[PDB]
Design a protein around this ligand. Structure first.
Ligand SMILES: Nc1ncnc2c1ncn2[C@@H]1O[C@H](COP(=O)(O)OP(=O)(O)OP(=O)(O)O)[C@@H](O)[C@H]1O
Ligand SMILES: Nc1ncnc2c1ncn2[C@@H]1O[C@H](COP(=O)(O)OP(=O)(O)OP(=O)(O)O)[C@@H](O)[C@H]1O
Ligand SMILES: Nc1ncnc2c1ncn2[C@@H]1O[C@H](COP(=O)(O)OP(=O)(O)O)[C@@H](O)[C@H]1O
Ligand SMILES: [Mg+2]
Ligand SMILES: [Mg+2]
Lengths: 394, 227, 889, 384
């Protein structure tokens, strides 16, 4: 009824928002700064207080000390090296050698110790964040879930049942099978359930251009790993990071093997990782090096194969629990139609079988819609199917 | 008046901007000169007249008359394959055409001295198109497998995925049977032009043009020497 | 341009209306037969809404407007047929014959005479004919007539009936979504006197449809989420009989009448309580309607079901009172012990694990105020039958050690341990009651008022805590005995023990820490009548607060119970009653915005909010009424939780610019509590905006303002992933943010969200939005934490057990008489529908489907399947009877 | 700026009126709320007084820096352009949220303290691999296929335009789409009509140009590529001719196939990684479908497998009709003799014949295209 009367009384106050919010001050869209209404702590005091008494305190690196006296030996980025001193504010206790310290530009004396270098590409592969994958969602391989989970979390959640019994729990475990079987998807439930540092590693990210370059990245990874008390290190697709040593004639695949040898050394030998648990997963395990496959590094050895019948029916009940369907279908018929089949294929059949109901104008799929999925996904894509030379893992 | 990619005079105490430092170089003139292609013309062509008339049809017409193909409702061509034995005028014709229709004659070699002007790494070759559409009436030229993949990566862009026109590519090589069949897709190449060895007449006129700058003696009978 | 050829309509209507002044006089047949041939042809050629470019409606008035202006006015002998041919043609194109000043001259064609039965040529057409024109009548014409001339001539009299038949033409033509245009006709028609058009359309709505009640019914509660106090007064009482007279859905009465309880008339929802006690249809809806009458949005109902039919349907009242409260116990007795609840989870303090090895060593924090929070390792985790046998030794050995308010605190944790109880919560207290301590006995007997909270059976009307009060001689025997009675009997409205506690106010004893929480005790019981409570408060306010210019012990405690005694009405009489009552100096006129805006929790009256910030914006206020302006922002903290997402964005968009950014004391000291009153809902928009001013502690202020916003920032229940944010701030909070004033505060902050995995519906929005007390018990703690001096001594009465209106958690409940059903449910995101097409898609979170007592969550709407039909209550209400029926083979 | 997200009555109602009237009173409250601050606290201008107070803090020689760590109490270690890094502090006008390791910041000339942060000048490659405009005409240009086009809209376009259908079904769209057949069968041509149709950020990459000469530069290029794809929007990543990573060996690659392998492994991660992927679609196309690793082709990585057959003759005449639509055809010709000339001609062949015939007319300056144009034209196109 009041067509313009709602529109302009709308519009003059939608504008009058901005017409006084410019008179507040949010404006002068910047080049990298902050809101003018926020910074006013450093306004009259820290502008000459966090600035004018404050130094630059250029950071350095300690070489070593000497006896009887401080007479410290400093080192900087490019320039020369000095004999330097502490400040009074610090003890000479935590002034150990090979340490970064904040140092004045004039007297060249030590102010505060610093943490060492972390190499932030290693920092990036800390995940910081958990996925949503439930152990309810990897149903069908519950014995593998149990046999893994009894290794992964049970000392971390209960470090007393192993101690008072008097056994040290294992540290290493690989997971392997054909692709799409639930290896990576299974790892996501661990990264879900967990709490500590979950540092993921994909081996092809270690492929470097320089020599020894990934090998130091390994070292740093174990440095910040040894900083944390308990830490879980994830290894995905480790066939890139190493099969074995086979060298003959011109040195082929030399560079990868040395990093693999560093990975051996960081795993076993001379006061090791302690409370750092590892977890590999491959596709084809047959390529892998035997000393890598030595226990003490890769103790638990979990297989992932296809489910028998009931795990498959359970996977039907996993992906199929949340879709509009005919009420009176049965899945055991479909599992009979899927002998050699992964749960990814089961999910793909679920998602295609919905699309059949999406084809004309149906809301819920039927049994024969599922049958329309079966021949296409199973039997029409049967030229590809990707599995059988991975069943033998070649 | 402040242009991107321009030197300046600068005071040193407060780094106050002082004055505009003229200009430095184009990133194509620099490397282009470093290459030093032997620029050519029609007046040094020895008896390749129908080849001239063919290449005019592919290159000259979609510049001077782009509407002329809208007169037929057909798309303009994009690619030129030139072949024959070496020493047969491929380079001078290719430079000659962009020289006369005033196209930016930019060949590529895949060298690494050229590389610093393209970028720090140029993970693709497609970074060249930044300068190419900047010199938009341009012609890319290529010599005789990396050339073969390179040209394909060009044509995949300028198959419709590049909207800037007047950028046309020329590959010059020999032994056409041994290159790629996907390159021999019939929708791929627009025209292939053969370059024969010279007959006795076309051996005479290159003696004529080439005999210009010499200090001669009267009476020579160049025909005999051409035979 | 193909002009010409078929120009019959720009020629013969260019001719015969032009030949009409040449054919009205001296041509009697051409006056009327060409007007008829102009009437049926402009009628027939404009009924269709496919050609809105009619061949005459934008063609003839290039001359037919000057012809009409000399044809209808300049004729002066208009007869009885030539007006039925004149005004049936000339009233049709006049919204487009005329431009935008049509509004003063719709009546110069129509009000001469309305031709007959105008819908006869407005039957096929929807809105181009005159419905747009009648919108132009009710927009401007009926507004100028019925601004002060409602009772009037033809401009109201026929306009009621023309406004009746056009409104039936909305629900006559298609029954499309143009039905919701009839609230825009009935509502824009006579804005304030809405009842006179709702009478014309209420009986017409009674004969309209039984299916077209629900979407217009929702449309009306959309129109009742906020209005001016007269239209929220009027449209909500007209809203009531539509599920009673037309529909008999009748089970959404009580919870959506809570709506219509306070503003209109307090006896109105009591006559609707009579309307509950008239439709004695059925045990099921009869049960489920009166389920909510005890501990879901109100109480004070347990004296109205003792009629002469006390067998089971009027013996329902006891089952409402305690037995379904025992089902609320039974949630934790059966359903929570099965899922995860252990007797002692205890391990959030174990989750405080890693600071000893993160950066050096530990064994450093040894504050005795850490033990205050270490009482909540017991206390917070043990709600909902978290009973402990000799796991209370952290409060037993600190019960006999120091910290007299900690002897109040550990004894006061036990009532939080035994919650919603009547059975053994008196038996567990007496094993630690007998210590002959002012501080142990008063906290324990204070917890006796916590155990029976919501029970209100025979536990302590004058039995136990009256024997605690009459011991009076000094401290907390005097103090902590009036608190649990106002707590458990806060939902009660009994006048008798309110007059047992009225001489506590009229005592005028100098125990001022008692006399301040006395008003907080008596205010929780009654919200309506008994002005003598207000007299008892303001008399001691004159006797004590006038003869001083000192601390907010008066200000935080005394007018707050007056806001409790006059909470919840938008009538703007109570502001005259209490604002002109303590007329005084401005520090006793601290109470100016108390009873004004405490009456105004959720409504639409932002003309009050402009008189809530225009008076005292900044004024530079050289340490004068920063308390009155922090209170003036404290009353900005209502009006925002329930304007159904209207003013919440208008609060987070405003307060982040106004106070915390460009304020001197209000934002930097106080104004973060809007984020502790608006929600506990939780979202990253504010939830990642507050640690920008928290993790930047900004210690140059009285930094227990920012650390006052620490645990408050942590005020959110419904536990989250925020242990990173809080545990990082306790990680820097081990060394910095000194444990000397904050060891209780960081762990109090951390343990607050995870009280228990459950038991977090504390946020005053039931069903969809109705209140459920939830404010009388919650609010005085945010009133209590303004500044300082109560983190140590005085506020340890409030900081434990202030809010205790946790109306549990879940809605997934069967409540069949056998109780053998579990459910068939499907939890989702909250709905988005206002008006849409076929069977309006409600939500879209199909990914989850359950059948059991599982979680509620904040934005959830839950439905079902299986042809259960859920015929009980159908909206929300968490105790569906869940009947079933299978007339769908 | 984001003041009120609610529009839901969408009519002439007192609801939508009272919205603004409420927010009218709030915005007037903000106006006269801030109006008193300068009325009783002039004391400054506050529009440039505190602002040039900040600009009187920060010096004009603003050195450009780069982060490498963060200590929360507004000081950190920051790297110089020379490399000799410092341990300066950070200001309060730095709006400490846009601070990630490796970012460019603004430093003092004197004490090198963290003045401000710097917006990053995009990336040369993002634009290079980023497709700007729609290439060409719609799906009506193609003709003849009409089945798998429904497949492509099904997996791609319909998820975009109608996200109601998957939600009423309780389902998510299929992930990976692959295209394979004989060469010149319109494989790229369909993707052009997709790039016409979509509004999403589109990326296109040849499978040939993945390979590098540096070790790991391929997989690094992959990781930053999927970084670019994820960081933008609902994006469409297209790959053409992915077989070329397996077919041809180049001597620019220092590694052999056992670097190509690692490249395909990192890509194989980026299809089916454990990380939250987001709204990126993957369209692949090649002609040698039997050659590559089937592990990339598993469901979970690719859901839809789309073959392109050779054209049948009644579709051929349609393709002739398309490639002869706007041209001045002299009526001398018969297309049906042109159909059966080759039994297995492609759609590239027809357009090659048509365009080359137009070249033959433009040899003779003509406007219409005669029969012998086609006669010698197919001699040019086919037989060599
Ligand atoms: N047991 C299972 N239940 C349900 N879904 C499964 C299961 N196993 C695999 N899937 C499906 O397979 C897909 C891929 O899982 P995952 O990535 O773990 O495969 P994989 O075994 O790690 O092999 P690859 O390393 O090649 O990925 C997931 O999207 C998941 O839907
Ligand atoms: N069905 C068709 N209709 C119209 N034109 C077609 C058809 N098929 C191919 N073409 C023409 O062939 C040209 C080549 O198309 P496109 O490159 O997409 O085929 P392709 O199979 O991708 O080729 P390649 O195998 O070389 O990648 C297109 O520009 C198109 O005009
Ligand atoms: N038609 C010609 N006229 C004059 N000079 C020619 C001709 N053809 C070749 N030449 C000589 O051969 C050389 C050019 O070789 P060209 O065929 O252009 O490149 P390539 O040999 O690499 O194919 C020049 O030095 C030129 O003088
Ligand atoms: Mg995997
Ligand atoms: Mg192609």
């Amino acid at each position: 009824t009041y067509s313009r009367q709602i529109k302009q009384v709308e519009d003059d106050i939608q504008q009058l928002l901005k017409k006084i919010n410019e008179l507040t001050g949010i404006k002068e869209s910047d080049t990298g700064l902050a809101p003018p209404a926020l910074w006013d702590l450093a306004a009259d005091k820290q502008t000459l207080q966090s600035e004018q008494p404050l130094q630059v305190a250029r950071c350095t690196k300690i070489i070593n000390a000497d006896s009887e006296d401080p007479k410290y030996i400093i080192n900087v980025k490019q320039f020369a090296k000095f004999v330097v001193d502490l400040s009074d504010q610090v003890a000479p206790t935590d002034i150990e050698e090979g340490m970064r310290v904040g140092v004045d530009r004039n007297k060249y004396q030590i102010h505060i110790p610093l943490p060492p270098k972390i190499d932030p590409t290693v920092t990036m592969m800390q995940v910081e964040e958990k996925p949503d994958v439930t152990y309810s969602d990897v149903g069908g391989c519950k014995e593998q879930i149990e046999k893994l989970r009894e290794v992964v979390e049970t000392p971390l959640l209960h470090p007393e049942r192993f101690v008072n019994l008097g056994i040290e729990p294992p540290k290493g475990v690989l997971l392997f099978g054909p692709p799409g079987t639930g290896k990576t998807l299974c790892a996501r439930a661990v990264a879900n359930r967990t709490d500590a540092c979950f540092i993921r590693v994909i081996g092809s990210e270690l492929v470097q251009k320089y020599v020894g370059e990934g090998a130091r990245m390994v070292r740093e990874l174990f440095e910040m790993a040894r900083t944390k008390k308990a830490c879980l290190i994830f290894f995905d697709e480790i066939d890139a990071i190493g099969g074995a040593r086979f060298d003959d004639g011109a040195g082929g695949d030399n560079e990868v093997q040395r990093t693999m040898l560093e990975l051996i050394n960081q795993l076993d030998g001379f006061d090791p990782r302690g409370n750092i648990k590892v977890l590999m997963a491959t596709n084809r395990p047959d390529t892998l090096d035997p000393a890598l496959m030595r226990p003490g590094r890769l103790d638990r050895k979990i297989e992932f194969s296809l489910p028998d019948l009931e795990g498959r029916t359970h996977i039907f009940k996993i992906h199929a629990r949340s879709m509009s369907v005919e009420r009176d279908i049965r899945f055991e018929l479909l599992a009979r139609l899927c002998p050699n089949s992964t749960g990814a294929e089961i999910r793909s059949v679920c998602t295609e079988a919905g699309m059949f109901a999406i084809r004309a104008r149906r809301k819920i799929a039927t049994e024969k819609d599922f049958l329309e999925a079966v021949n296409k996904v199973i039997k029409s894509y049967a030229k590809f199917s990707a599995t059988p030379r991975y069943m033998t893992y070649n | 008046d402040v242009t991107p990619n321009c030197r300046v005079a600068l005071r040193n105490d407060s780094y106050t901007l002082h004055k505009i430092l003229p200009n430095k170089v184009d990133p194509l003139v620099s490397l282009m000169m470093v290459e030093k292609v032997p620029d050519s013309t029609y007046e040094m062509i020895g008896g390749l007249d129908k080849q001239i008339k063919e290449i005019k049809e592919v290159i000259e017409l979609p510049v001077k008359h782009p509407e002329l193909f809208e007169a037929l409702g057909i798309a303009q061509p994009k690619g030129v394959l030139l072949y024959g034995p070496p020493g047969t005028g491929k380079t001078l014709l290719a430079r000659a055409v962009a020289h006369h229709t005033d196209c930016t004659f930019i060949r590529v070699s895949g060298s690494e001295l050229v590389q610093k002007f393209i970028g720090e790494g140029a993970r693709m070759v497609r970074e060249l198109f930044v300068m190419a559409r900047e010199h938009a009436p341009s012609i890319i030229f290529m010599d005789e497998s990396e050339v073969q993949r390179t040209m394909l990566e060009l044509l995949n862009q300028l198959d419709g995925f590049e909207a800037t026109k007047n950028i046309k590519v020329i590959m010059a090589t020999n032994r056409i049977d041994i290159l790629d069949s996907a390159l021999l897709r019939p929708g791929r190449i627009d025209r292939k032009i053969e370059f024969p060895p010279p007959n006795e007449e076309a051996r005479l006129d290159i003696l004529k043009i080439h005999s210009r700058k010499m200090n001669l003696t009267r009476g020579i009978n160049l025909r005999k020497i051409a035979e | 341009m193909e002009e010409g050829g078929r120009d019959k309509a720009p020629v013969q209507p260019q001719q015969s209306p032009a030949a009409a002044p040449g054919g009205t006089d001296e041509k009697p047949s051409g006056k009327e037969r060409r007007d008829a041939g102009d009437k049926d042809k402009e009628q027939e050629l404009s009924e269709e809404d496919k050609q809105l470019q009619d061949e005459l409606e934008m063609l003839v008035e290039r001359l037919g407007e000057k012809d009409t202006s000399l044809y209808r006015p300049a004729l002066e002998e208009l007869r009885r047929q030539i007006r039925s041919s004149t005004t049936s043609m000339t009233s049709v194109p006049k919204p487009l014959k005329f431009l935008r000043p049509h509004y003063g001259k719709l009546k110069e064609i129509y009000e001469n005479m309305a031709p007959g039965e105008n819908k006869r040529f407005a039957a096929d057409i929807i809105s181009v004919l005159a419905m747009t024109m009648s919108g132009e009548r009710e927009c401007l014409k009926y507004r100028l007539v019925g601004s002060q001339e409602e009772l009037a001539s033809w401009g109201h009299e026929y306009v009621r009936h023309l406004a009746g038949e056009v409104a039936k033409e909305w629900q006559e033509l298609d029954d499309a979504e143009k039905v919701q245009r009839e609230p825009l006709l009935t509502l824009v028609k006579e804005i304030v006197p809405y009842n006179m058009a709702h009478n014309a359309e209420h009986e017409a709505c009674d004969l309209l449809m039984e299916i077209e009640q629900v979407d217009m019914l929702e449309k009306d509660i959309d129109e009742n989420a906020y209005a001016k106090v007269c239209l929220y007064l009027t449209s909500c009482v007209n809203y009531v009989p539509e599920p009673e007279n037309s529909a008999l859905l009748r089970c959404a009465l009580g919870v959506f009448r809570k709506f219509s309880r306070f503003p209109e008339a307090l006896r109105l929802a009591l006559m609707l309580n009579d309307m509950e006690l008239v439709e004695d249809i059925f045990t099921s809806c009869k049960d489920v309607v009166v389920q909510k009458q005890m501990a879901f949005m109100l109480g004070r109902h347990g004296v109205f079901l003792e009629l002469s039919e006390d067998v089971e349907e009027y013996e329902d009242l006891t089952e409402i009172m305690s037995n379904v409260q025992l089902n609320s116990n039974f949630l934790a007795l059966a359903r929570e012990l099965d899922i995860m609840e252990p007797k002692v989870p205890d391990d959030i303090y174990k989750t405080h694990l890693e600071n000893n090895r993160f950066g050096g060593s530990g064994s450093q924090v040894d504050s005795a105020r850490m033990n205050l929070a270490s009482s909540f390792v017991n206390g917070f985790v043990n709600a909902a039958f978290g009973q402990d046998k000799l796991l209370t030794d952290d409060g037993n050995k600190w019960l006999y050690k120091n910290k007299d308010h900690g002897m109040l605190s550990a004894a006061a944790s036990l009532g939080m341990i035994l919650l919603w109880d009547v059975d053994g919560g008196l038996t567990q207290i007496d094993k630690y009651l007998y210590s002959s301590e002012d501080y142990i006995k008063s906290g324990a007997l204070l917890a006796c008022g916590i155990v029976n909270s919501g029970v209100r059976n025979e536990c302590d009307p004058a039995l136990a805590l009256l024997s605690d009060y009459v011991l009076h001689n000094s401290n907390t025997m005097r103090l902590g005995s009036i608190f649990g009675l106002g707590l458990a009997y806060a939902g009660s409205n009994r006048e008798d023990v309110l007059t047992l506690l009225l001489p506590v106010m009229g005592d005028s004893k100098s125990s001022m820490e008692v006399a301040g929480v006395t008003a907080l005790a008596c205010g929780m019981i009654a919200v309506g009548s008994c002005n003598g409570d207000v007299t008892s408060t303001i008399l001691q306010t004159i006797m004590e607060k006038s003869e001083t210019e000192l601390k907010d012990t008066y200000a935080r405690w005394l007018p707050l119970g007056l806001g409790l005694n006059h909470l919840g009405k938008g009538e703007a009489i109570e502001a005259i009653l209490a604002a002109l009552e303590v007329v005084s100096e401005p520090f006793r006129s601290f109470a100016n915005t108390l009873v004004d805006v405490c009456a105004y929790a959720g409504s639409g009256n932002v003309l009050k909010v402009q008189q809530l910030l225009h008076i005292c914006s900044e004024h530079f206020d050289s340490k004068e009424k920063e308390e009155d302006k922090d209170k003036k922002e404290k009353k900005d903290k209502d009006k925002k939780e329930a304007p159904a997402d209207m003013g919440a964005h208008q609060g987070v968009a405003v307060l982040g610019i106004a106070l915390i950014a460009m304020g001197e004391e209000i934002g930097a000291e106080m104004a973060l509590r809007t984020f502790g009153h608006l929600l506990r809902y939780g979202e990253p928009t504010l939830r990642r905006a507050v640690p920008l001013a928290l993790a930047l502690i900004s210690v140059s202020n009285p930094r227990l303002n920012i650390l006052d916003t620490l645990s408050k920032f942590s005020h959110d229940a419904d536990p989250e992933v925020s242990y990173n944010s809080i545990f990082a701030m306790g990680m820097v909070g081990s060394g910095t943010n000194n444990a000397r004033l904050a060891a209780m505060l960081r762990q109090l902050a951390q343990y607050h969200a995870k009280d228990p995995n459950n038991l977090f519906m504390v946020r005053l929005a039931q069903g969809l939005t109705h209140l459920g007390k939830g404010t009388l018990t919650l609010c005085p703690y945010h009133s209590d934490r303004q500044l300082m001096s109560q983190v140590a001594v005085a506020g340890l009465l409030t900081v434990l057990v202030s809010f205790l209106d946790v109306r549990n958690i879940i809605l997934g409940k069967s409540h069949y008489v056998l109780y053998g059903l579990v459910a068939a449910m499907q939890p989702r995101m909250l709905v988005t529908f206002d008006e849409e097409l076929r069977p309006l898609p409600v939500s879209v979170r199909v990914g989850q489907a359950v059948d059991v007592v599982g979680q509620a969550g904040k934005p959830k709407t839950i439905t079902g399947f299986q042809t259960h039909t859920t015929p009980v209550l159908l909206a929300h209400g968490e105790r569906a009877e869940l009947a079933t029926e299978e007339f769908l083979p | 700026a984001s003041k009120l997200p609610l529009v839901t009555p969408h009519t002439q109602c007192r609801l939508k009126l009272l919205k603004l009237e409420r927010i009218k009173d709030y915005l007037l409250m903000e106006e006269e709320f801030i109006r008193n601050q300068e009325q009783m606290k002039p004391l400054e201008e506050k529009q440039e007084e505190e602002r040039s107070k900040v600009d009187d803090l920060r010096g004009t020689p603003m050195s450009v820096g780069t982060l490498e760590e963060i200590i929360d109490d507004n000081h950190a270690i920051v790297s110089t352009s020379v490399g000799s890094e410092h341990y300066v502090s950070i200001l309060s006008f730095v709006d400490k949220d846009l601070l990630e390791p490796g970012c460019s910041v603004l430093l003092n000339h004197k004490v090198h303290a963290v003045i401000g942060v710097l917006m990053d000048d995009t990336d040369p490659l993002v634009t290079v691999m980023k497709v700007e405009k729609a290439p060409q005409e719609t799906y009506a240009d193609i003709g003849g296929l009409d089945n798998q086009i429904q497949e492509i809209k099904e997996s791609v376009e319909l998820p975009l335009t109608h996200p109601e259908y998957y939600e009423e079904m309780g389902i998510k769209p299929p992930k990976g789409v692959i295209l394979y057949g004989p060469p010149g069968t319109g494989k790229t041509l369909l993707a052009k009509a997709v790039a016409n149709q979509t509004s999403a950020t589109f990326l296109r990459v040849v499978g040939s140009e993945l390979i590098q000469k540096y070790l790991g530069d391929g997989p690094k290029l992959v990781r930053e590529l999927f970084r670019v794809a994820e960081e933008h929007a609902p994006s469409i990543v297209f790959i053409d001719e992915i077989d070329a990573i397996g077919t041809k060996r180049y001597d620019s690659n220092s590694g052999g196939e056992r670097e190509i392998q690692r490249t395909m492994l990192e890509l194989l991660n980026q299809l089916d990684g454990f990380d939250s992927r987001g709204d990126v679609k993957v369209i692949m196309a090649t002609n040698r479908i039997e050659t590559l690793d089937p592990a990339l082709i598993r469901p979970g990585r690719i859901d839809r497998k789309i073959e392109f057959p050779l054209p049948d003759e009644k579709t051929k005449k349609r393709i002739f009709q398309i490639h002869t639509s706007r041209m001045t055809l002299a009526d001398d010709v018969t297309l049906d003799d042109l159909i059966m000339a080759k039994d297995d001609l492609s759609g590239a062949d027809i357009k090659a014949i048509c365009t080359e015939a137009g070249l033959m007319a433009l040899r003779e300056r003509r406007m219409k295209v005669t029969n012998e144009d086609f006669k010698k034209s197919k001699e040019n196109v086919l037989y060599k």
